[PDB]
Write an enzyme that holds these catalytic residues in place. Sequence first.
Site, PDB file in Angstrom:
ATOM      1  N   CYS A  39      28.090  23.094  46.334  1.00  0.00           N
ATOM      2  CA  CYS A  39      28.912  23.890  47.245  1.00  0.00           C
ATOM      3  C   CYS A  39      30.339  24.098  46.762  1.00  0.00           C
ATOM      4  O   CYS A  39      31.050  24.973  47.258  1.00  0.00           O
ATOM      5  CB  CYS A  39      28.922  23.262  48.647  1.00  0.00           C
ATOM      6  SG  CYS A  39      29.427  21.524  48.748  1.00  0.00           S
ATOM      7  N   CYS A  66      31.898  24.511  50.014  1.00  0.00           N
ATOM      8  CA  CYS A  66      32.839  23.373  50.173  1.00  0.00           C
ATOM      9  C   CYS A  66      33.985  23.380  49.123  1.00  0.00           C
ATOM     10  O   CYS A  66      33.955  24.159  48.159  1.00  0.00           O
ATOM     11  CB  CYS A  66      32.080  22.034  50.149  1.00  0.00           C
ATOM     12  SG  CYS A  66      31.447  21.535  48.531  1.00  0.00           S
TER      13      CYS A  66
END
Length: 241
Positions: free
Chosen positions: A74, A156
């Site tokens: 991510c 992320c």
Amino acid sequence: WRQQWSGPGTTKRFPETVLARCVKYTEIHPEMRHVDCQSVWDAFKGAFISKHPCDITEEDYQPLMKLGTQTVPCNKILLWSRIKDLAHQFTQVQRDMFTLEDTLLGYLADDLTWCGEFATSKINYQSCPDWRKDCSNNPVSVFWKTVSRRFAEAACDVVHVMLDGSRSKIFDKDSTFGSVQVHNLQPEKVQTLEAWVIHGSRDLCQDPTIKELESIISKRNIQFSCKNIYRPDKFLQCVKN
Ligand SMILES: *[C@H]1O[C@H](COP(=O)(O)OP(=O)(O)OC[C@H]2O[C@@H](n3cnc4c(N)ncnc43)[C@H](OP(=O)(O)O)[C@@H]2O)[C@@H](O)[C@H]1O
Ligand SMILES: Cc1cc(NCc2c(C)cccc2C)c2cccc(C(N)=O)c2n1
């Protein structure tokens, strides 16, 4: 009487293409090799055949999403807006980074069009609904909305986004990125969104629409950052160093 939409019809050989794409992706991405590509096609097909091409829901694409589960790292995610070409050149060079189209499901559908019709199992190769003139809940649009959301939610750390520095609106709030992706980034996982404004002569990070972008992101408690990319081909060869 055969119904005519305003958009181009399903790409020629679309079934044979999607299936070929799935097989090829699995061959080169060893972690996907167990995936049954004939089941992946059937699920894709299942989402839109026999349905009115304006009555498509995200839930229609669930069987396909499940089979194409792929949570890439991510912290390696690249978003883009109206500058798909270069975004893809980047992830060919910076091979650890991923765009949506480098994921299996996005790889399958990239550059393609498709629709069916109510009650029959026929694919419509002559026309498909234009999102603007006909209806926004068509097979293609609903597909991209669904995978975009899951993709952007997974993201992320520092999320990066390329923007086209030549456009009248460098950040366009009425686009997949400005209207879908940006509102799906999660404050828990995402620290920063870093915009890369790609030039096609002056600091375009000052631009009014970038400030709009910063405002949107600021309200989600996510930090913002912007960087000019003056020489495109020069940046491509300077990422790894
Ligand atoms: C997830 O999505 C972005 C990439 O999407 P982006 O390049 O921002 O999308 P655009 O709006 O530039 O173009 C997408 C195509 O789809 C049409 N379209 C459908 N629905 C639309 C809405 N609601 N607004 C605007 N455009 C829409 C567009 O047609 P027109 O531009 O209207 O001709 C266009 O063909 C990446 O970050 C990826 O990760
Ligand atoms: C044909 C198409 C449409 C896309 N988005 C449409 C859209 C928009 C602009 C706003 C709100 C919702 C939707 C669904 C789209 C998004 C990302 C990528 C691709 C790609 N890689 O072909 C892609 N393609």
